[PDB]
Design a protein around this ligand. Structure first.
Ligand code: NAD
Ligand code: NAD
Ligand code: AG2
Ligand code: AG2
Ligand code: AG2
Lengths: 474, 474
């Protein structure tokens, strides 16, 4: 049977019942022991309400807002008799404020994004830097500095950000084994960072190819995606963003850094979902990805930073997303950016609408002695349907990661504010792996120089194939 | 019943029986009187042969090459006893060499592209300027100057290039009429150029949106299009090219001019099918087009050039393609450029495989008093099926233009080498319009600066919305 990892003895307050809430609820019911009615779902959507009613869960049809979130959430989180768990899977809500509220009230917390209150992402008076995931993440790091320890709150623990942090650790272990690098497995951040350095890992792509195909053709003036349309558009219109490696010797003219914070990132003055990068996955082989900003682009580069005694970085990997979403989402971005405005309507593909495909999601570690190594999940829609309900393959990678984070938090409930990079990666992957389909490590001799230069002159650097100069599509 | 325009008393030699040849054959049979034994098709393809056999037409299964074209075509084109007609709808053959051969032997000639012999388009030894459509066109103009007059030979008379030159003339007349300007239409090149100047037309997009959708989802590693995949990929890997307007105040760093020739164009040192421009059509409204090189980008700009007494251009419109192909072609380009190689296989969508959609193809005249005006054809797949066999909507705009050019040629026997800009636009549109669906003119207040600047700073020129600086996606 399915493993039951823990008992939960307090309220489980799920904020949001979109594609990820819908996929996560069945895993929570499956893998935890608790009186069923301790679970309650909060979502303003009529669609969400109807689905929640069919699943027989307490449902509160309300938008969580800056004005109401304390009045709304505290009674739910503190109902007792035991410790509650806030499972935040929403858009338009402040991750930071809800996290701090849960912690004030002794409730566990998990989310999959550092989301702001409604009005941030398209605020015209905000500087591009302030709209960056680096900036959003720095608010979480500052919160941790302000109130160290206390109740566990897990930030950005979905598939990516989230699971991919655990993949990076496993990939580093595998590379070390394959390259004959000796020593016991790292047990501290500094040891992980030095292992990456010693292996010669210049950078990392979060290298993803979603091949899920719908049973209907893309409709005109409809944004189609396999997960949040609102969320993908939000991150897609944020600046392109990357963890910035010490080996990089070029940045584009419209790249900018940060005056404060962990120091691990740069951003570009252009939207990430209209920024292309050359990348690679096992099934796609060479492909374009979009350089969409992601928390882990910064958190992984930060985590793997080696500093000298003076606090200066001597090593840091480049790290960023290289996302090839489903074909209908590729068309949706072409339509949105070509129109200069969001489509009138949108839809998220249901498993019943998907005719085949996989969400191939892994980490591509490059620059080392075997050139490039991709490690990750090749989960298909067919396998997804066999092992978890109410979601597609994109959804299941995310929901299972939330499941893993919940198990970790319940096992470690007084660890304070943590990121996916802070968790025990083996324990998390132990929990998650039943839901990931084939999990494989693949070497390739592909580099961003492949086939180049072609018929035209290009701004390339063939002395160093993996330079961002070569990866960025200009 | 359908009109029969003319008798053809000599051989009709069709070179090529791909998507355009298959669509053009029935129109030639429909609209001209000739003994069936006079028409013969030449194509090396087995698939083409089987279709030709099913249609009861003479078929010679042979590739036309530099080595064999004289030995093959001179007898066929002079079989007699009257004047023959070479209808060249092929790839990998020299338009110039074949048109000169037809002329030398008194046969009429028409084609839809200035195509070179096999070995030219992907030659990395040739400099990008020499691979340009500007340069190919100059060879045709030179041939005309060296042997003026003689047998009529029509260059680049498909939908675009071709028909869209007629649309520009009709659009100019319409713009004037809509302003309350009465009187004689232009009758010389110089007068057409002056009309464009006088109306304040700053530039022209060949503004196309193909919404034909397939009955099957796009296959991986298959290039899908609604017309020649080989031809589209070839032009798409040529440099981006555009007729260059006198109003333009900026060009990109990798733009280059031509040291000789008509002077009307520039090219970019990058492939046109991976170059995006902001544009507009009635059904698409604001969209991205690809800046794919096209003969008419140069020929229309050249045609509409006004020079001073010193022979210096004082007015010329910008003119270029702004192509949004069918959704599966958009995905095919994303795939080809992202992988850095041509797909393993390709297919052209048959009308039986198209569930709906239109080929909306027109000219967008901008910069005048009513800002922008789109004039052109909205041909649906539904309309296409009602009125012509063996083709989709893309095919029928092209095949009907070839029909119109043929009627024109038979009515204008000794015209020498002519461009679509040289043809009598009202006569050609009279013949073509039954096959075009609605031919409509639509004003819009949209400009490339709609919604800009937005969330990020941009190098835009707010003093002049239609500047290429604002159009080009950078
Ligand atoms: N880390 C990852 O791997 C990952 C992956 C997918 C999604 N995400 C994030 O997870 C979140 C959920 O994604 P999804 O695919 O379920 O999105 P979705 O768009 O399907 O659902 C979002 C839900 O939030 C609800 N909502 C909107 N405003 C709200 C408010 N004020 N209070 C409460 N609920 C509100 C909506 O009604 C909707 O049901 C998004 O923020 C998304 O960016 C992270
Ligand atoms: N101006 C326009 O609007 C326009 C529009 C569409 C196509 N075109 C041009 O028309 C031509 C045909 O397009 P299509 O859609 O029919 O292309 P297609 O790829 O469907 O067909 C091309 C045909 O040419 C044949 N061919 C190849 N080599 C040959 C040779 N050496 N001799 C004779 N035939 C040969 C092929 O076997 C094939 O059947 C292309 O050059 C294309 O660029 C112009
Ligand atoms: N349904 C619940 N609330 N808990 C179920 C425990 C796990 C049984 N598979
Ligand atoms: N420093 C450079 N320019 N190149 C370094 C390249 C290292 C790849 N062997
Ligand atoms: N089949 C021909 N060759 N010509 C036919 C023209 C008249 C058809 N109604």
């Amino acid at each position: 049977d399915w493993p039951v990892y823990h008992r939960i003895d307090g309220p489980i307050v799920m904020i949001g019942f979109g594609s990820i809430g819908r996929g996560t609820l069945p895993l929570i019911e499956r893998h935890f022991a608790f009186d069923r009615s301790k679970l309650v779902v909060i979502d303003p959507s009529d669609e969400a309400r109807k689905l929640a009613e069919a699943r027989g869960v307490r449902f509160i049809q309300q938008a969580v807002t800056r004005d109401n979130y304390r009045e709304l959430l505290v009674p739910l989180l503190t109902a007792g008799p035991g410790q509650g768990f806030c499972v935040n899977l929403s858009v338009d809500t402040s991750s930071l404020d809800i996290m701090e509220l849960a912690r004030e009230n002794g409730a566990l917390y998990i989310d999959t994004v550092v989301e702001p209150w409604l009005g941030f992402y398209f605020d015209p008076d905000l500087k591009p830097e302030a709209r960056s995931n680096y900036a959003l993440r720095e608010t979480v790091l500052a919160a941790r500095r302000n109130k160290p320890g206390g109740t566990t709150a897990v930030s950005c623990c979905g598939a990516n950000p989230g699971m991919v942090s655990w993949f990076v650790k496993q990939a580093l272990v595998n590379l070390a084994a394959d390259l004959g690098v000796t020593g016991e497995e790292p047990t501290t951040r500094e040891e992980w960072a030095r292992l990456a350095m010693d292996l010669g890992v210049k950078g990392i792509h979060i290298a993803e190819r979603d091949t899920q195909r719908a049973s209907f053709p893309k409709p005109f003036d409809v944004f189609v995606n396999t997960w949040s349309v609102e969320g993908f558009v939000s991150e897609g219109l944020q600046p392109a963003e990357l963890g910035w490696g010490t080996f990089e010797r070029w940045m584009p003219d419209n790249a900018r850094g940060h005056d404060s914070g962990c120091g691990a990132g740069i951003y570009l003055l252009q939207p990430g979902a209209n920024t292309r990068v050359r990348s690679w996955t096992p099934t796609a082989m060479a492909q374009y990805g979009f350089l969409v900003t992601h928390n882990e682009s910064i958190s992984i580069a930060d985590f793997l930073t080696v500093r000298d005694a003076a606090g200066q970085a001597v090593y840091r990997p480049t790290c960023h997303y290289a996302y090839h979403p489903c074909n209908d989402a590729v068309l949706s971005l072409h339509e949105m950016f070509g129109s200069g405005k969001r489509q009138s309507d949108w839809r998220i593909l249901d498993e019943t609408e998907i005719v085949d495909g996989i969400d191939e999601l892994g980490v591509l570690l490059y620059g080392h002695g075997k050139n490039a190594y991709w490690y990750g999940s090749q989960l298909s829609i067919e396998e997804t349907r066999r092992i978890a309900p109410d979601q597609n393959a994109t959804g299941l990678q995310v929901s299972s990661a939330v499941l893993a984070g919940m198990v970790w938090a319940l096992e470690n409930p007084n660890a304070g504010i943590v990121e996916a990079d802070d968790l025990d990666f083996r324990r998390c992957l132990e929990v998650q792996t039943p839901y990931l389909g084939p999990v494989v490590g693949v070497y390739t001799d592909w580099t961003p120089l492949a086939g180049r230069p072609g018929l035209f002159p290009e701004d390339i650097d063939t002395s160093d194939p993996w330079q961002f100069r070569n990866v960025l599509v200009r």
